[PDB]
Amino acid sequence: AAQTNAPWGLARISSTSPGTSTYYYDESAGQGSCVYVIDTGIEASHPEFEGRAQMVKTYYYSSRDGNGHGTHCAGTVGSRTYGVAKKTQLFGVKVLDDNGSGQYSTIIAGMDFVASDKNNRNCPKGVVASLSLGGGYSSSVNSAAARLQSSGVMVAVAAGNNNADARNYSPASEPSVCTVGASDRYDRRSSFSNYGSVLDIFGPGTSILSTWIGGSTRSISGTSMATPHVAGLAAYLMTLGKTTAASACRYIADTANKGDLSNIPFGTVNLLAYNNYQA
Ligand SMILES: [Ca+2]
């Protein structure tokens, strides 16, 4: 179904071309799947989440999202208006403080938490984790992301916003997870988007409207915004039975719009996330 006047990124992920504004998707909408948003938290009370979001873990004095970044990302995964998978269950894991910062040790603990926690949740169609965060290369951070993936979770991670090769960042550089670059509404690589061999896919990342704290909305940009498009897409596809956690990144690459993005450096995939939904 449509979304007439959907955010451009939603319309893009269900389209064979840029420049349209209706989002088309199977009504199953990720029902029975779960997506963990590992970030600054999620404002679960936001009407856009319809009771489908909840905080399950924090490493700080509160589970409240005092930043907005996590709420925005969660909105792109699964909010009613701004989300890819409009019926998924959203679980917030607050590894980032209200300034958007987090020690790698806390981020690692959060990933291992999700690998266990999914066994305490009802996700018959599958489990996804969205990591719109990163820093410099760390073998321990990469290994944590690898474990999470190995445990049966589709892990999607931001490539980073350095306009640089993502090989030097973590968890972006972990081969076994799905590393997500950002594009704009004109099918250009977003100017800040990292690139390189370690990228698996691109998603909408420039000027993305979604939920914000205080029951609000706003448009922001980043590989942080592209990542939840891919995470939501995975949840949606898993509900459809088209793929699994272990195979979703490959499946998304297999079925992506190919060769349509501009300013993709030689050696980086030219693949844009696409739901292949035929109304
Ligand atoms: Ca990767």
Swiss-Prot record:
Cofactor field: Ca(2+)
Keyword Protease: yes
Catalytic activity: Hydrolysis of keratin, and of other proteins with subtilisin-like specificity. Hydrolyzes peptide amides
GO cellular component: extracellular region
Binding-site list for Ca(2+) 2: T16, D260
Domain Peptidase S8: start-end pairs: 7-279
Active site residues per record: D39 (charge relay system), H69 (charge relay system), S224 (charge relay system)
Keywords: Calcium, Disulfide bond, Hydrolase, Metal-binding, Protease, Serine protease, Signal, Zymogen
Cofactor: how bound: Binds 2 calcium ions per subunit.
Disulphides: C34-C123, C178-C249
Record flagged with keyword NADP: no
Binding residue positions for Ca(2+) 1: P175, V177, D200
Described function: Hydrolyzes keratin at aromatic and hydrophobic residues.
Protein name (record): Proteinase K
Organism: Parengyodontium album
Location of this fragment in the whole protein: 106 to 384 of 384
